[PDB]
């Protein structure tokens, strides 16, 4: 057929009770998570086509860039907290891979300052035990789906996103078989 089980997208042998609609897995230390959402836009483009009623959701992981890292997961943390995904999503990408001026806690703490977030609404959160089960909820999901890698995808927590059975040579048809392919597992 045209989608296909092993080509486009794979099963979890192990499906996810109560999983979001479409979870997607990536790290601001992520070459290729750089590249899917701030060249390719994958995110963005998938979000274009989903069904009325189908949210996204994006998980930060710690595996990548030790303690930075795992700053990072708890600071992700406190934009899904404040809602202000949309405002830090780019510098801090930006900051942690082509500028590298994010080195330390404070040095993302400085991205939400200077993107208006107030420092105290900031530290608040930061320290909240409200943001430390979100870095619990991230890190539940990843052993849930039995993560090896980012950025990945997964839908209603029964299908895994292939980018490797995709085409790969423009980056927009890449784009939107992957986004078409979101779509489609959304609907099964």
Same mark, same amino acid.
């Given at each position: 057929?045209?989608?296909?089980?092993?080509?486009?997208?794979?099963?979890?042998?192990?499906?996810?009770?109560?999983?979001?609609?479409?979870?997607?897995?990536?790290?601001?230390?992520?070459?290729?998570?750089?590249?899917?959402?701030?060249?390719?836009?994958?995110?963005?483009?998938?979000?274009?086509?989903?069904?009325?009623?189908?949210?996204?959701?994006?998980?930060?992981?710690? $595996?990548?860039?030790?303690? !930075?890292?795992?700053?990072?997961?708890? *600071?992700? =943390?406190?934009?899904?907290?404040? /809602? #202000?995904?949309?405002?830090?999503?780019?510098?801090?990408?930006?900051?942690?891979?082509?500028?590298?001026?994010?080195?330390?806690?404070?040095?993302?703490?400085?991205?939400?300052?200077?993107?208006?977030?107030?420092?105290?609404?900031?530290?608040?959160?930061?320290?909240? $035990?409200?943001?430390?089960? !979100?870095?619990?909820?991230?890190?539940? *999901?990843? =052993?849930?789906?039995?993560?090896? /890698? #980012?950025?990945?995808?997964?839908?209603?927590?029964?299908?895994?996103?292939?980018?490797?059975?995709?085409?790969?040579?423009?980056?927009?048809?890449?784009?939107?078989?992957?986004?078409?392919?979101?779509?489609?597992?959304?609907?099964?």
């Amino acid at each position: 057929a045209q989608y296909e089980d092993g080509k486009q997208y794979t099963t979890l042998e192990k499906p996810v009770a109560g999983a979001p609609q479409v979870l997607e897995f990536f790290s601001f230390f992520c070459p290729h998570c750089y590249q899917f959402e701030e060249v390719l836009h994958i995110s963005d483009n998938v979000k274009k086509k989903l069904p009325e009623g189908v949210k996204m959701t994006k998980y930060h992981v710690n $595996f990548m860039g030790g303690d !930075l890292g795992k700053d990072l997961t708890q *600071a992700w =943390a406190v934009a899904m907290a404040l /809602g #202000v995904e949309d405002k830090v999503t780019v510098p801090l990408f930006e900051g942690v891979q082509k500028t590298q001026t994010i080195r330390s806690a404070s040095d993302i703490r400085d991205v939400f300052i200077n993107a208006g977030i107030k420092g105290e609404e900031y530290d608040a959160a930061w320290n909240s $035990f409200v943001v430390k089960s !979100l870095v619990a909820q991230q890190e539940k *999901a990843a =052993a849930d789906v039995q993560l090896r /890698g #980012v950025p990945a995808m997964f839908v209603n927590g029964k299908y895994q996103l292939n980018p490797q059975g995709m085409d790969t040579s423009n980056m927009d048809v890449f784009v939107q078989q992957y986004a078409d392919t979101v779509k489609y597992l959304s609907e099964k």
